[PDB]
Amino acid sequence: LSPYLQEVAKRRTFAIISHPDAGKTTITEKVLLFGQAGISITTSVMQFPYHDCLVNLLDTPGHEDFSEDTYRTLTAVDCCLMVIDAAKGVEDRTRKLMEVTRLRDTPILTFMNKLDRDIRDPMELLDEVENELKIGCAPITWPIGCGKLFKGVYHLYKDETYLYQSGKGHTIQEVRIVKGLNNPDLDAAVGEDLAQQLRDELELVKGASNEFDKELFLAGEITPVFFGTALGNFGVDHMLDGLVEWAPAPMPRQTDTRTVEASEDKFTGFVFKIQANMDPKHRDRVAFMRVVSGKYEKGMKLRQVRTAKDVVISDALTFMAGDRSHVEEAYPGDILGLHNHGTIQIGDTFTQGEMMKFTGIPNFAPELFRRIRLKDPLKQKQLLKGLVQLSEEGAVQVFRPISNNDLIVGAVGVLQFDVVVARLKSEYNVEAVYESVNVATARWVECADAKKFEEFKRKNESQLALDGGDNLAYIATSMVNLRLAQERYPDVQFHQTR
Amino acid sequence: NIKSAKKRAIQSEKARKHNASRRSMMRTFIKKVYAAIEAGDKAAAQKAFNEMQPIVDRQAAKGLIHKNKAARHKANLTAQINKLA
Amino acid sequence: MVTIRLARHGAKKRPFYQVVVADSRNARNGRFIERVGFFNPIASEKEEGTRLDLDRIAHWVGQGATISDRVAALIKEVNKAA
Amino acid sequence: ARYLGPKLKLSRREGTDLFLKSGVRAIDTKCKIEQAPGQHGARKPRLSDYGVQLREKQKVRRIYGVLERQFRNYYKEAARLKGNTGENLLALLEGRLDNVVYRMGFGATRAEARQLVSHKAIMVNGRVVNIASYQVSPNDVVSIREKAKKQSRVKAALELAEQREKPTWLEVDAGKMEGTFKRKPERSDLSADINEHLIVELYSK
RNA sequence: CUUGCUUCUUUGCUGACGAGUGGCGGACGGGUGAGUAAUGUCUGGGAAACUGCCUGAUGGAGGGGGAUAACUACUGGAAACGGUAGCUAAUACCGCAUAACGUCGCAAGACCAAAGAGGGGGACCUUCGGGCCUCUUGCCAUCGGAUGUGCCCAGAUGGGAUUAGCUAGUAGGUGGGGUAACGGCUCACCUAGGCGACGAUCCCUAGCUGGUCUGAGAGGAUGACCAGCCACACUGGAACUGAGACACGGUCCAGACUCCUACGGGAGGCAGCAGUGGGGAAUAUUGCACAAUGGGCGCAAGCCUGAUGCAGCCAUGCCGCGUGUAUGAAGAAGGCCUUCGGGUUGUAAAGUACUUUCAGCGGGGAGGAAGGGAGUAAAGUUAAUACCUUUGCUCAUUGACGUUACCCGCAGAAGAAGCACCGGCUAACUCCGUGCCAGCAGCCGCGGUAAUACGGAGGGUGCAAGCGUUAAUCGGAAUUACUGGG
């Protein structure tokens, strides 16, 4: 009964995936209230000054052009918080997120948001979920009526009846507690016919659903739902008890040899994203890590596996309530931030001597948009550095042709307004307004072995282009040139590097 | 500045009254003898010199006065009080 | 406070110490009064390994120079009866 | 650093035999010496003073295999010595280790001697030397280590040593390949043909 | 209850120690040349001086008192940060006895100081806190020595006359005050002096020197890295502690800038090491460790050190090596020229025989390391075979570099050659395409249809992991001539 594993058990993961226009930022800002601490272009991590346990968050942009980040950061997070709006319903967003989450069998707690607006019938929404996702659910509560009449929460497995007050978005207030279920004073304070309809719907829940499970909750077969609004400061207050009681210890993750448990050593903190950092005086690029296996040390010396080097790293930033706090060590199960300068890419593994790799990197193939043409052409060095600084990321990869002009911006998504807004910083001052220039399909990256690529360079030396990380694939113009490249036979051990 | 060795600041504050206050009372005794120089009473001048001599020798001993200032005070003040007498 | 100490001259990965009399507030390669003898730690057996003039060292002992540990070890190396 | 190219074209370019193609075979006459240095070698040049100085410098250098910065360092070392600069410069050129290995007969040509020095085979005073620019001190003994001794490449090339002048200032054992170095060579002993005066006039301006 | 295998409340009792008082260090080490044309630096002297820590000599170290932090209880503020009512200790503070070659005075005479701790123990006495015996360490007063610092004088240390008079505490004296100290250093009175054509006052520039480059020498530019001095720490000014700062990581005020806030109020100064922005043509890593030296404290063990010892990048500069060697004519193939005979590329390449420098991998392996710790034999000390200093001697040992330098073995000539020029200066030749268009060029200069001068090809020359261009200094320039011109 050592306290080490007992506080490993107090470390839980809930990242947050949802629809566009769903309410990620509001529910995170209000969970920050619960621990006494365009749209969506950031990723934020909140460790917490929470009382009982210490449950990490990790935000991500939810769109189709966005959420390229969450394919590799849902691998970091054991559990899953779904947020579905009633006006949006079950869309292709939820089908894509479930095609992500079914590959690892994550436990899923869902949370229906936007209770201030109009919401359809509850049985209709649960039937839409169970039909278009083919996965059942177990409802616990249902608030009052429709429209703006939602003014209560009626628990079944806790037998607690709470009421709601309006206009509590700024300050934390408490509403009095009614214990009884068949209380006629509750029928007088709420409304008799509406409460009878709610009791009839709870009888339909008890007669047309199942109960909760614990061994099937781990795979995620019966996913529980939770109701309430993000603005009224009421519905998310009940989430914390479920986050404590339902989420298990963080599971082991697969390596090439076997699964590494959370009681072992040899820190497996590999880097997930290289996110677009804000730059007051330094960059640090970011270092999100999986330090679930092994308790922190202040003077520990990490080992880069893919370059096999002993790197002394003593400074580690912790994300206390969003602000990058001081030099602090903690208990295993957290996510760090380190001080890197162009050395570590996505998915570079770390151990203390176990020279093996993971099975991650779910990144995809890009769609090459238009150009860099350097408006106000004085001081070109800010984009020759600062976008190549952003070229190591999974979303942005800057490509360099030989003719030293017309640099290609490589985005996997469609909306390149992210980089245009990111060109307005202390070391970013060029506008580069976009137009239409056609570059067809993603520059499929391949580099040959020795005594073979020399003639490949010498035959068509005007048809090469440097890449992010000093690569030379062929050139991306058409499918016919890719067929000629396949006809050219570059026989090599293939590295995707995407 | 944020420093573990800021103790020498406020301790010097703890000095800058007390030692200086001793210097204060020291020089007032010296000025008292100058009052006798403005008085013309040689007996009062000798009494004031005998009153100021042990405290100025003690302040010359305690590191505040560097034993040549106080010697200069005794020298020129003795010269004044026996030129008057 | 005057002292007799080494000065660490030479090249990179090639040390060559200078036993020298200097004030303790001076730098290692800084100002010195006068030099006396030398020491070479990589001077394995050849025609000369260590010179050390004991007359000026005794004169600085007669003045109050604090001898460091390496200089006292060199005094115990240059022994009066050996 | 090394030339590694047309070593016999240089002998046609200077006209005299630079002994770069000394070899097992005798005087070749296989390259049309003195009448074809290159494509338009039938032309007779004006051949001025700076011309003959530069040709004499490049002739002595491609005899001894020394690059220009290194030969300028040898001239700077010969300038501070006693006597006269012209004898001292040729003494410093003879004091190279690969030249001593060449004079011993341990290799047919000078590049072979430089390769034999470079490949950890030549050992002087019990200490192996890889740099061919080793300034040979007087009263030394040069030999070949037992792990690299007589793998036939020293052997037949030693027969060329039976056809050379075999100069006085060094002695070879020829039974165990143990040479012996002696006093510095006189100017009237080394090759009797090269002109130090043009080199001194070139490096004096 | 396996009554000893653990949990548990008290307990500074031991090893040690967050915070606090106090001692030392912070005035050294590190960084820059902004300001400065002499208040700076260098050379040579001088007296009217100071000096903790180092050390020599001579004495004392006797006897007392009062506060305060930390702490206790409450309270203002979110934090930063205190206030109120009480308590205590010291090598912290302050009195009392005495005091000498110390201070004052011609002398008589008067005055000036402290602090005790740690190890071990025989007799005596133990209110059994211990006095006592010894050793180590620390304090006070004086005289010295060295180191460092303060002060003064002479000479030397850029340009401008399109910079000609400047100065009024100014120059000198007397008296008072001030500094470790002469000194208008600072005040009261008296005279009109003081500097200046040997460049006074004013403007611009500049850290100075030992030195560096060039030059036969005399000279010219520079002084970035090594070292000494000076000045500075966002700017200006001022004081305190301290022997030493009129203070990089100390204080206050005036100004500008940044950040937090609950908005009542605070924090800050990378011309330190790294690192970031702007500028530029131009310059690096947000790395390891006290393994060695040195600095700080301690008796010692121990702690810190971005100085340093290194590690990573850059051909930025110097040095050395390799990218093969010997043989090899059918004088092969391809390119170029031609008189179309042939020549050149060319022993170059192909073939054969050997070799593996340096890199790759796999194994041995110094030196940078002196010390320090435990213990033994013990010479001193003492009453003591006890504590402590020192010397032999026994043992476990102290490396970031470091998979070190270096050596051996394995695979395969196998992984490793470019850049400028070819009319003269100045080293090296032709052909083709345009034709004062395109272009090259350091100067004279070519190209206006048969260019040794543009571009391309072949070939050669020179230098070599560097080669050309650009930028600065000197020589040539006796075109700043004192050497050495008119």
Ligand SMILES: Nc1nc2c(ncn2[C@@H]2O[C@H](COP(=O)(O)OP(=O)(O)CP(=O)(O)O)[C@@H](O)[C@H]2O)c(=O)[nH]1
């Ligand atoms: N009244 C009300 N409005 C809500 C609630 N939750 C979300 N909204 C509204 O829906 C929108 C969602 O805002 P936002 O939090 O930025 O969405 P998001 O989930 O972060 C977007 P993304 O998923 O891409 O990260 C806003 O207009 C917000 O006001 C809720 O509980 N009540």
